[PDB]
């Protein structure tokens, strides 16, 4: 599988583990451990993606200047979307760390449920953008 895909898969599986909100997850969410590891996984996926596009660019079919330039900007938007989705997840995980502190020891069972449901929507979005971005790259 492409390198960029294997890197995204690592970000994906790590995130599917955090969605469980098991005991260790929670322990790691009240540090910055989780958001640091995610961020690292994210940055590796984007690096590989940028290198894969650059290589693919060595073996195109040549088309109208107008056509290529468009395809390239549409690919660059989709790459952006991926990155921002990854950030939006890392973001929500910060917010939760804070909310927990703001509770002052009280039960976080409610915060957990709401986090779980929102994380799931953010992951749904990430997956959709990854799929779209994959479909664009194979046209390339």
mmCIF file of C-alpha atoms in Angstrom, residues 29-31 35 39 87-103 108 111-112 114-116 118-119 122:
data_model
loop_
_atom_site.group_PDB
_atom_site.id
_atom_site.type_symbol
_atom_site.label_atom_id
_atom_site.label_comp_id
_atom_site.label_asym_id
_atom_site.label_seq_id
_atom_site.Cartn_x
_atom_site.Cartn_y
_atom_site.Cartn_z
ATOM 1 C CA UNK A 29 -5.545 12.191 27.499
ATOM 2 C CA UNK A 30 -4.963 14.148 30.653
ATOM 3 C CA UNK A 31 -1.369 14.518 29.597
ATOM 4 C CA UNK A 35 -2.204 14.792 21.202
ATOM 5 C CA UNK A 39 0.408 15.142 15.961
ATOM 6 C CA UNK A 87 -5.869 19.167 13.661
ATOM 7 C CA UNK A 88 -9.589 19.450 14.504
ATOM 8 C CA UNK A 89 -9.349 16.058 16.224
ATOM 9 C CA UNK A 90 -6.192 17.043 18.177
ATOM 10 C CA UNK A 91 -8.098 20.194 19.090
ATOM 11 C CA UNK A 92 -11.161 18.476 20.528
ATOM 12 C CA UNK A 93 -8.817 16.286 22.627
ATOM 13 C CA UNK A 94 -7.354 19.495 24.211
ATOM 14 C CA UNK A 95 -10.648 20.867 24.873
ATOM 15 C CA UNK A 96 -11.558 17.690 26.773
ATOM 16 C CA UNK A 97 -8.388 17.874 28.850
ATOM 17 C CA UNK A 98 -9.439 21.351 29.926
ATOM 18 C CA UNK A 99 -13.060 20.526 30.654
ATOM 19 C CA UNK A 100 -11.843 17.723 32.878
ATOM 20 C CA UNK A 101 -9.637 20.156 34.838
ATOM 21 C CA UNK A 102 -12.553 22.580 35.056
ATOM 22 C CA UNK A 103 -14.562 19.896 36.836
ATOM 23 C CA UNK A 108 -16.263 12.952 33.905
ATOM 24 C CA UNK A 111 -17.823 14.556 29.341
ATOM 25 C CA UNK A 112 -16.706 11.085 28.107
ATOM 26 C CA UNK A 114 -20.108 13.628 24.618
ATOM 27 C CA UNK A 115 -16.460 13.319 23.648
ATOM 28 C CA UNK A 116 -17.071 9.828 22.192
ATOM 29 C CA UNK A 118 -18.229 14.017 18.723
ATOM 30 C CA UNK A 119 -14.951 12.145 18.046
ATOM 31 C CA UNK A 122 -14.820 13.967 13.408
#
